[PDB]
Amino acid sequence: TLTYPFHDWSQELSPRYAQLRASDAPVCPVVSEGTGDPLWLVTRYATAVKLLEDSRFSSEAAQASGAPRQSPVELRAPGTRGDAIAMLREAGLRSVLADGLGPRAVRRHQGWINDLAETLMSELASREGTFDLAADFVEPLSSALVSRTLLGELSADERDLLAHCADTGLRFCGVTHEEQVHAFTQMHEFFLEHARRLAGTPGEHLLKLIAEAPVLSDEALAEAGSLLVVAGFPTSSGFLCGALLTLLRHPDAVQELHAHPERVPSAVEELLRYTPLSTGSVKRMATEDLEIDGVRIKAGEVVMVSLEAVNHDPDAFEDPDVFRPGREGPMHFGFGRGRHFCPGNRLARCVIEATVRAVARRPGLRLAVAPEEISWHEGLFFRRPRAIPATW
Ligand code: HEM
Ligand SMILES: O=C1N[C@@H](Cc2c[nH]c3cccc(F)c23)C(=O)N2CCC[C@@H]12
Known part of the structure; x- marks a missing residue:
């Protein structure tokens, strides 16, 4: 009888989570709002650990065509495969992914990332009055992360296009079925036309390392760009926005971290x-x-x-x-x-x-x-x- 998701769009989680946790069963049945599909929902830590470590519960199978799903629309560019990450690991790109996302990549980029973050806060601190941490801090920082470490050099207009696609495609509601699907088609066709070029620009960004990987066609590259947008853009920007909120609402903890910089990782x-x-x-x-x-x-x-x-x-x-x-x-x-x-x-x-x-x-x-x-x-x-x- 319970339909999903719970429409808790702010930071205040839905009371239903605590409710399902306190119930008898470790899984509770719900119904997808967008499709009417019946779904099992896990809310307890112990159960979740069991479920996510049991590889007999498959992630890639959960998006074969016909799968029950929580999203109103299939989250792919129509005609395309999906599960780009399986596609990429299956094409023997694990070690490449290691170079583009692992400690080697962190080392390449941690210098400028911290420099960027301090410059943006500096610029904001040298103003009189108030300002918008989302627009003036998160957006440029996450934009630069996606550009510099994932896709390669993006213009302002190309960044705006992919960010709109992610905000339009990655929704439970607020856009028609065909708007939402169209966002993935837009992204797909952008990367079909540009993935090659973005790959060849300067720097050591993932998409270039993928393109120079021995085994990738434009189609494959396009599917990689889309995946990297979806996985790293609206996630990074959403998360940092919420983290800044959490920090600004906890001055005491901020002061503790100011006095004790070695406590930041735990933070x-x-x-x-x-x-x-x-x-x-x-x-x-x-x-x-x-x-x-x-x-x-x-x-x-x-x-x-x-x-x-x-x-x-x-x-x-x-x-x-x-x-x-x-x-x-x-x-x-x-x-x-x-x-x-x-x-x-x-x-x-x-x-x-x-x-x-x-x-x-x-x-x-x-x-x-x-x-x-x-x-x-x-x-x-x-x-x-x-x-x-x-x-x-
Ligand atoms: C550069 C930024 C990011 C990149 C490139 C990235 C990439 C990815 C990729 C490719 C996957 C798929 C793994 C798989 O299904 O095998 C994934 C999964 C995941 N990512 Fe990220 N991610 C980024 C940022 C974030 C952030 C900020 C969060 C914060 C919550 C996050 C949380 C997750 C979670 C929970 C999963 C697991 C989804 C699942 O198990 O079905 N990621 N990420
Ligand atoms: O809302 C969603 N979440 C992800 C999984 C996820 C949960 N928490 C995350 C944090 C960062 C990145 C993620 F992929 C996730 C997912 O499978 N979705 C399928 C339909 C709705 C969409």
Whole structure:
């Protein structure tokens, strides 16, 4: 009877999560709002760990055509394959991905990322009055991350196009079915025309390393660009927006980090636990009849895990709704878990850290409006406020 998602577009999670957690079963049935498909939803940490480490619950099978799904529309450019990451790992690109996303890449980029983040805060601190941390800080920083580390050199107009596509394609509601599908077609056709060129521009960005990988056609490249937009653009920008909100609402913790810069890493990891991002769930499909903490899951059925509900599980985390850097509980779910642990985790932790440090070097940064007055994009997969009015 319960339809999904829960329309908790702001940082205030839906009460339903705590409700499902407190229920009897470790999985609860819900119904997709966008398609009427029946779906299983996991909200408890213990269950989620079991589910995400059991590779018999498949991620790639969860998007074969005909799959039950939480999204109103198939999240691909029509005609195209999908699961670009499986396509890329299957083409023997793991080590390439390691170079473009791993500690080697972090090393290449951590210098400029931190420089950029400090310049943006500097420029903002040398103004009189208030300013918009979303537009004036997050947007250029996440834009530069996507450009410099993932796709290659983007113009302002190309950046705007892909950001619109992500905001239009990656929604539960607010756009027609055909608008949403059209966003993926737009992205696809942009990368069909440009992936080659973006690959060849200067720097050491992932898309170029993929193109120079021995084994990739324009089609394959285009599918890689789309995947990298979807996985790294609206995620990074959403997350940093929410992290800045979390930080500005916790001056005490900010002051602690100002006095103790060695506590910032623990702080980033608490941010990934505390700050919500996605409004939907990671999802997998039972590749056979399976049993989840006693619940029988039939082949073909799809099991969702809300990382938000799991990150806020009190059985796992003491005082789960409090911001506590240096807390010592289990591992957070902000990046998932298991074989599909976000490969973007190093670059995302890089940029997250650069941001937490720029803020902590400048105590007194605060909201210029009440948290309740912040305006949210409604219907997005990845939460993002319209603006973050802030000031010193
Ligand atoms: C440069 C930025 C990023 C890149 C390039 C990136 C890339 C990816 C890719 C390719 C996947 C698919 C892994 C797979 O299914 O095998 C993934 C998964 C994931 N990413 Fe990221 N990511 C980025 C940033 C982020 C951020 C900021 C978050 C914060 C929550 C995040 C959270 C996740 C999660 C939870 C998954 C797992 C989804 C699932 O298990 O179905 N990523 N990422
Ligand atoms: O809302 C969604 N979330 C992702 C998985 C996810 C959860 N939390 C995340 C944080 C960062 C990156 C992610 F991919 C996720 C997903 O499978 N979706 C399918 C339909 C709706 C969309």
